[PDB]
Amino acid sequence: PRLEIHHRFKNFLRGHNVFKERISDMCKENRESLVVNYEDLAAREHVLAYFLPEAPAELLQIFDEAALEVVLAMYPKYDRITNHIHVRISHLPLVEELRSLRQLHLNQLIRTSGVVTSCTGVLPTIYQNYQRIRIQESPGKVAAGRLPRSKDAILLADLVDSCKPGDEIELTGIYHNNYDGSLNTANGFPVFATVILANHVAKK
Amino acid sequence: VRDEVAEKCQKLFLDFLEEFQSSDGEIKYLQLAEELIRPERNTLVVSFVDLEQFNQQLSTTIQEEFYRVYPYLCRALKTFVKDRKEIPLAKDFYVAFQDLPTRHKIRELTSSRIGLLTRISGQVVRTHPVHPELVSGTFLCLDCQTVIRDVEQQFKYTQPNICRNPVCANRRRFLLDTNKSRFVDFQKVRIQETQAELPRGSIPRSLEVILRAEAVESAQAGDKCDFGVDGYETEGIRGLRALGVRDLSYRLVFLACCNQMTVKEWEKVFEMSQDKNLYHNLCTSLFPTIHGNDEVKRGVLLMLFGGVPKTTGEGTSLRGDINVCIVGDPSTAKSQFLKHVEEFSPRAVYTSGKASSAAGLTAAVVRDEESHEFVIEAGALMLADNGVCCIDEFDKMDVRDQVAIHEAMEQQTISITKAGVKATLNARTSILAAANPISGHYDRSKSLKQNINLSAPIMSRFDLFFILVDECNEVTDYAIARRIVDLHSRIEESIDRVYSLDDIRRYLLFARQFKPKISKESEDFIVEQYKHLRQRDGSGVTKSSWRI
Amino acid sequence: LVIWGTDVNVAACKENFQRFLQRFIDYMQRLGEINVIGEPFLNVNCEHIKSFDKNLYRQLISYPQEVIPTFDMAVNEIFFDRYPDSILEHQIQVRPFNALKTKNMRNLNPEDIDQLITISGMVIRTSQLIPEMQEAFFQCQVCAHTTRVEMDRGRIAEPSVCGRCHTTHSMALIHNRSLFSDKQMIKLQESPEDMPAGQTPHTVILFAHNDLVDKVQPGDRVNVTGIYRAVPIRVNPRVSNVKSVYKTHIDVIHYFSEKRVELLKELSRKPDIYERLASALAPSIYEHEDIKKGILLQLFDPGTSKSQLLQYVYNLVPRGQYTSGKGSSAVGLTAYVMKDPETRQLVLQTGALVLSDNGICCIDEFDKMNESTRSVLHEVMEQQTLSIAKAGIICQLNARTSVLAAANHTLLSRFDLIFLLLDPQDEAYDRRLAHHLVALYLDMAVLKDYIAYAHSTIMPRLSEEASQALIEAYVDMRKIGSSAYPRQLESLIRLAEAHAKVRLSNKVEAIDVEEAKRLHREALKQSAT
Known part of the structure; x- marks a missing residue:
């Protein structure tokens, strides 16, 4: 929880041939997002991907703080198209599935996977800034066929609607314990309650 | 008292606390240790057997000192990793005993036994969903100060009321550094007094005791139990009332964690086993x-x-x-x-x-x-x-x-x-x-x-x-x-x-x-007669109900 | 040296009572039974002792809250000197039984506080478990010392003496041995059974503790001693303005006729009281005497003499409760399950059937x-108790009672029995009925005890005198048109149960069974097509 890396990372956004090649990749498209892999950060600097359990939430703020800058810097064309970036980072190895879950592993940016048990694709500004999707994982086996604690995740306004009911896909996010339903102000996972913020998705 | 009791235990503990039997000391502790770090369970057990040899006072004073011996022995415990930098990354633990010589009925789990040591026998009843409320942490007043690492903890809603400037809650405070919190784990469940033990006129007792993380999803309703201050501001000051204090007083307070006659009756049973x-x-x-x-x-x-x-x-x-x-x-x-x-x-x-x-x-x-x-x-x-x-x-x-x-x-x-x-x-x-x-x-x-x-x-x-x-x-x-x-x-x-x-x-x-278990033969008479059973039943005999 | 607050001298009668415990002798068998066995907790009566000592005595009720201690001391002064090498940790607190003639707490004074008392009542309900705080300790601030408050002996169980530092109980209480206190509310009901009616009796704010906790059950009958307490009612806990009434709540500290009989004996000797009392019973009406009969036994067209009779039963009897369907469901009997909304918590809400155990x-x-109700009675009658598996108290409800009713469902099978008020279609009988009314235009209290002493004393036995006859009987009762091999026998005995519950004879013959034939027969016949 120190403060230099913000400015550095804003400069680290300026392993970087991929960035130079990815910044050109996205683009005139105007997609309001930015994607990096756990290899991409460490390929440049391994200090960065080390933040992902420790300050991913701020790292997202950092990445958002920097992604606004270099991109509007690189392309002021975006000044008239939404003037904002909401990042969409890539794989982040490891993966805690549906019953690999730990209070240990929370408040952390992780990759995992899960399958729609329910979705709110067309409905939700807090709620309107995201939506909900209810989730579990497994296939059929006798032991795996046992009922798991379903994942109930939120999609923060950019990964939204890319997940569809029946999608056995790969959910990356930040995995918080902000289950403020503790005194009637949130939802979260069951027993090992984790408020998971969301960062990446696989395909239908 | 609070400090010496918080400390003096640890010495009596620690030397006891390097796993003793089958030769002694460090080897048996390391088995318990290496069993712990590797699945990252953070759980152990401390048999009451060796202790009362070692110190039954510990084995007793637990019951007499459980509720402030905990948060220090709790804290000293945690360098099992053999590295103090890997302990604060840990979230919690859960331990158990072995072979307390007692349990007590619920009606025997009395006011004069609230909170105490619990051997845990009864009837899982009327379950719930399961939530990690917060043990310790802060919401400290943004306008004036940051973290103080104590609030919620007891079954309670907010904590901290000693010695402002913002530190006491005679001031606003709500936002929580949610990244910084001991949201732990539990549900509340209404464990009954087992009627199968009870003297007819009974009316059972649905104790609202918890299954916190280690006790969790191991049971189903009907089933076993196998588990510095401020000011000198004293009592009587105008404004203080007990109705903010009582609702726990309205509650449970304890919790839980995860022969001739033989032969004679056997003989008569043997005789009965001999009996045509x-x-x-x-x-x-x-x-x-x-x-x-x-x-x-x-x-x-x-x-x-x-x-x-x-x-x-x-x-x-x-x-x-x-x-x-x-x-x-x-x-x-x-x-x-x-x-x-x-x-x-x-x-x-x-x-x-x-x-x-x-x-x-x-x-x-x-x-x-x-x-x-x-x-x-x-x-x-x-x-x-x-x-x-x-x-x-x-x-x-x-x-x-x-x-x-x-x-x-x-x-x-x-x-x-x-x-x-x-x-x-x-x-x-x-x-x-x-x-x-x-x-x-x-x-x-x-x-x-x-x-x-x-x-x-x-x-x-x-x-x-x-x-x-x-x-x-x-x-x-x-x-x-x-x-x-x-x-x-x-x-x-x-x-x-x-x-x-x-x-x-x-x-x-x-x-x-x-x-x-049946012999290699016995199947035949099953078969030949199940056949014959089906055979008469399959041939058109006078039927009572087409089952076969 | 004095306690002007209660006017007791320094021990003020003590040394009369120390010798009393040794001078009572004819205690002296009991004086060791407490120490040597280990059974504390004296259990006195309405203290008859007043033949011994009045200055000891008059005090007994008087301000004895400062005396019972001295007793529980003074006993122990002697008792610990009697057998100090026994289990002497069994301290003794007295528990009287059938205490002094309470003036029906309905009537007791505002004054009547420092007063050992007893109920003549019935239970409405118990606390179930809610005991309370015991002793204090705060933390102060010279490096915060944890400061005994009510842990400090000599201080009081006040309100606001414990206004801070809850863990300094609420954890420390475990860590410091004040494990919280102990007290048990109950809602009872004073009920003299022939109250003036309308005006109604006093329910109870019971609270007091001891591990006689729960040894009084809901619905219970009373043998119960206590002492008064009360507390001024704040206009608010937030304020000191005063509702000038004290909120009563009670320290539980509990544990001619022969001539009438001779008259009964004549009535018992009298041979046709089954007819004579029948001639006396429900006298208000002419014929349908046959119906009138079984009420005695059972004691043992709308309202067309009916509620009258049931009110005759109601009137005749304390033990019973009148109600009916169609406005008052099962709830007016039982299973009214609902909360104290002032506290928002379910209660074993019930009704008349809970008023009816060992009743009618x-x-x-x-x-x-309905079927949402009356499936109750499907279950009740096959039980005589009622499983209430509910939120706060899963239980069953012994309603070992009796029933009768009538209306204008395959399970008439159960019924005690009811009959067919049909039209004789006879102007003359109407005239006889009219004459019964035109003529219209003691025995009970005798009855009231006639029914009683058998309910007190008598126990029929249907043995080989006439146990055979039942066997001879249901043969005769089944066979005509050949059901009585069903519990008709168990009804028949339940009918033959009566005549020997009559007559003060605990033993039975064909007569005193045989009457019940005609009853069940005529009851079958009138109910037969």
Whole structure:
């Protein structure tokens, strides 16, 4: 929880041939997002991907703080198209599935996977800034066929609607314990309650 | 006191606390240690056996000092990793003891025993969902100061009220550094006092004790328990009131974590095991006041007795329990007796049959949405787990049990479903059954179908059926209630037994520990006769019901 | 030296009582039974001792809250000197039984506080478990010392003496041995059974503790001693303005006729009281005497003499409760399950049937009962108790009672019995009925004890005198048109139960069974088509 890396990372956004090649990749498209892999950060600097359990939430703020800058810097064309970036980072190895879950592993940016048990694709500004999707994982086996604690995740306004009911896909996010339903102000996972913020998705 | 007790324990602990037996010291601790870090469970046990040798005062003063010895021994504990930088990354632990010489009833878990050491025996009841409320942390006043690492913790809502500037909560405070919090883990569940122990006039006791993280999802409702200040601002200052303090005072406060006679009774059991006529030697002792129906009791006798196949085809472990019916006239026609008879046994649950609002076995959490009527308990069925269920009036099962038994029989479970909630349970117990038919005995010429007046897919499932047809047989009936008056003949009579209605309960205790298995031969007479059974039944013989 | 607050001298009668415990002798068998066995907790009576000592005595009720301690001391002064090498940690606190003639707490004074008392009441309900705080300790601030407060002996169980530092109980209480206190509310009901009616009696704010906790059950009958307490009612806990009434709550500290009989004996000697009392019973009406009969036994067209009779039963009897369907469901009997909304917590809410255990139920409108109710009575009658598996108290409810009703469902089978008020279609009988009214235009209290002493004393035995006859009987009762091999026998005995519950004879013959034939016969006949 120190403060230099913000400015550095804003400069680290300026392993970087991929960035130079990815910044050109996205683009005139105007997609309001930015994607990096756990290899991409460490390929440049391994200090960065080390933040992902420790300050991913701020790292997202950092990445958002920097992604606004270099991109509007690189392309002021975006000044008239939404003037904002909401990042969409890539794989982040490891993966805690549906019953690999730990209070240990929370408040952390992780990759995992899960399958729609329910979705709110067309409905939700807090709620309107995201939506909900209810989730579990497994296939059929006798032991795996046992009922798991379903994942109930939120999609923060950019990964939204890319997940569809029946999608056995790969959910990356930040995995918080902000289950403020503790005194009637949130939802979260069951027993090992984790408020998971969301960062990446696989395909239908 | 708070500090020395917080400290002096650790020394007496730590030297005790390097796993002692099988040679001594560091090796056995390391097994416990290496077993811990690697799955990242953070759990151990501390046998009360070695301690009372070492120091029973510790083994005692726990009960006398549990509630402030904890948060320091808790804190010193955590360098099992052999590295102090890897301890604050840890979230929590849960430990246990071994071989406390006591437990206590709930009524024995008293005000003068609240909070204390708990050997943990009883009845899981009326479960809940499971939440990690916050032990310690901050919401410290953004306008003036940041973290103070203590708030919520007890079952409570906010904490911190000592010595502002913002530090005390005579000031606003709500935002929580949610990244910084001991949201721990638990549900609240209403553990009953087991009626199976209880002296008839009882009225059980649904203790609202918790299953926190280590205790979690290991049980189901009906089942085992195997678990500096401010100011000198003193009492009496204007403004202070106890109603902010009492609601816990309104509560539980404790919690939990995860022989000649033998041989003589055996000898009589051995003699009984040597005893011929044993069914008759058994029967009337259990079925004293029924005439006829010697077959019907004969199974019900056996219906008591179990015996299981495991899974070896990788299916389910197969049925051992039994599901048989007695069918006929109106309770007076004593099927009531049998339900009542069985009661002379434990592991035994007893309905008002079915015409009974008693909505249990339609399970649901009792604090769904503000407080909720339907309870997490199919003690209608579940509560006899590894016992037996006894149901009159089974035809009045109209819906909620209706499909319910079907799978439950079949699967020994209760797939709960709410579409925001969903579970499955386990009920491994037998189903004693009896229900009246349409309006009477008409089955002499009418098909069981609709004479049973129930649904094929369960009557089919019933292991057997039996009958109690009523008849005015003066060749007998002169003698019949001749019994019953002689059964009404209380004043100078006592009902003759073959033997106790206890030893039997110890026989069947003695009986099911023995196991059985058929020879390479015995299958034949199964086959040749099951054949012959099907053979006559498959050839067009006069049928009672197409089952085979 | 004095306690002007209660006017007791320094021990003020003590040394009379120390010798009393040794001078009572004819205690002296009991004086060791407490120390040597280990059974504390004296259990006195309405203290008859007043033949011994009045200055000891008059005090007994008087301000004895400062005396019972001295007793529980003074006993122990002697008792610990009697057998100090026994289990002497069993301190003794007295528990009187059938205490002094309480003036029916309905009537007791505002004054009547420092007063040992007893109930003549009935239970409405118990606390179930809610005990309370015991002793204090705060933390102060010179390096915060944890400061005994009510842990400090000599201080009081006040309100606001414990206004801070809850863990300094609420954890420390475990860590410091004050494990919280102990007290048990109950709602009882004073009920003199022939109260003036309308005006109604006093329920109870019981609270007091001891591990006689729960040894009084809901619905219970009374043998119960206590002491008064009360507390001024704040206009608010937030304020000191005063509701000037003190909130009563009670320290539980509990544990001629022969001439009438001779008259009864004549009535017992009298041979046709079954007819004579029948001629006396429900006298208000002409024929249907046959109906009138079984009420005695059972004691043992709308309202067309009916509620009258049931009210005759109601009137005749304390033990019973009149109600009916169609406005008052099962709830007016039982299973009214509902909360104290002032506290928002379910209660075993019930009714008349809970008033009816070892009683007689006067239902009406039995035709009008639902299946959401009346499945109760499907279950009740086959039980005589009622499983209440509910939120706060899963239990069953012994309603070992009696019932009767009538209306204008395959389970008439159960019933005690009711009859067919049909039209004789005889103007003359109407005239006889009219004459019965035109003529219209003691025995009870005798009855009231006639029924009683048998309910007190008598126990029939149907043995080989006439146990055979039952066997001879249901043969005769089944066979005509050949059901009585069903519990008709158990009814028949329940009818033959009566005449020997009559007559003060504990033993039975064919007569005193045989009457019940005609009853069940005529009852079968009138109910037969």
